[PDB]
Amino acid sequence: SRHVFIRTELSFIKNNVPCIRDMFFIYKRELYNICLDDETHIYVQKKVKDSWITLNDLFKETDLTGRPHIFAYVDVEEIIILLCEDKKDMTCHRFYSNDGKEYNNAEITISDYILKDKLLSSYVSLPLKIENREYFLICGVSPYKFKDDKDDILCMASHDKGETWGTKIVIKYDNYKLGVQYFFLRPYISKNDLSFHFYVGDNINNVKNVNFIECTHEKDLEFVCSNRDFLKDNKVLQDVSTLNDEYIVSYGNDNNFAECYIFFNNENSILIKPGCYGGTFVKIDENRALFIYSSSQGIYNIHTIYYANY
Numbered sequence: 001s002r003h004v005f006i007r008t009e010l011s012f013i014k015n016n017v018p019c020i021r022d023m024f025f026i027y028k029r030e031l032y033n034i035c036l037d038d039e040t041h042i043y044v045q046k047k048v049k050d051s052w053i054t055l056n057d058l059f060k061e062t063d064l065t066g067r068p069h070i071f072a073y074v075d076v077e078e079i080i081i082l083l084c085e086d087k088k089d090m091t092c093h094r095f096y097s098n099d100g101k102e103y104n105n106a107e108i109t110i111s112d113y114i115l116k117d118k119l120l121s122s123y124v125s126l127p128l129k130i131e132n133r134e135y136f137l138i139c140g141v142s143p144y145k146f147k148d149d150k151d152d153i154l155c156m157a158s159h160d161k162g163e164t165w166g167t168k169i170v171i172k173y174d175n176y177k178l179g180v181q182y183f184f185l186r187p188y189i190s191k192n193d194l195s196f197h198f199y200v201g202d203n204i205n206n207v208k209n210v211n212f213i214e215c216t217h218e219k220d221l222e223f224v225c226s227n228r229d230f231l232k233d234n235k236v237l238q239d240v241s242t243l244n245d246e247y248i249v250s251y252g253n254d255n256n257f258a259e260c261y262i263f264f265n266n267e268n269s270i271l272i273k274p275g276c277y278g279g280t281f282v283k284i285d286e287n288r289a290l291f292i293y294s295s296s297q298g299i300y301n302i303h304t305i306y307y308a309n310y
Helices: none
Strands: 004-014 022-026 031-037 041-048 051-057 069-074 079-084 090-097 107-110 123-125 128-130 133-141 153-158 167-173 186-190 193-202 207-217 222-227 236-243 246-252 260-264 268-272 280-283 288-293 299-309
Touching (some): 004 051, 022 069, 022 123, 022 280, 022 288, 069 133, 133 193, 186 236, 193 222, 207 236, 236 280, 246 280, 246 299, 260 288, 260 299, 268 299
Parallel strands (some): 069 123, 167 222
Antiparallel strands (some): 022 031, 041 051, 069 079, 079 090, 128 133, 153 167, 186 193, 193 207, 207 222, 246 260, 280 288
């Protein structure tokens, strides 16, 4: 590591919509955000200048009840968002769009879906490339398992841009804990490698600790994932990403998240100090990334990071 370049720039973005949950993704060198607003609305927002602008509300297109699950898949030319209601068949609504502003409506359904027991949550991700096939993943985790049986994590995939979900991805997680709650399973597909970032409840300390597991390609459609250790004393793990083919991990000083730290390959460090709770990475390219949190209501501190190592 002869040459190491690190530089961060702080920017602020204001939003007129109070989002319960935030989902950020970049597309064609532009930052987007799927925002949930509770009449309940689901706005698609694009970042221009110093503020979020609302492009289109897609919840009004279906007229669901309550807050639905959101599965957004970003590709190089198209964006695909699925709104699934929170029976035996999964009822979703698949939206297609080559441009960011206008979306095509289409109601879909999955017969005898495998994720009836599993706890699923919202996330954005990109196609998972296996050989010459590209898959969209709807993943779930069983939120609790009293005694041992073993598909604790399983994803249903689609190689057709989300119209037929008949494909199944096996996730062999040998370290799934009995008698413990799992909360926020999201797949992290950097490059063409599958990874998972979820939460585990520690019943003796009463704390939700994040877990990160790397997956390898054992079989063509079956993966073997094991835990990756990012624990460091007196600091709570937050988010994980990859820059320069190296892990960049966000930490918090404590569970109050008064100040956030970012470590590059577990050696270099940057201290972020405004509450930075809810901060998440948005990878722009292989050497740039974003760090977005909301220190107060109606604003978003975005930290643009450049990391390099020759």
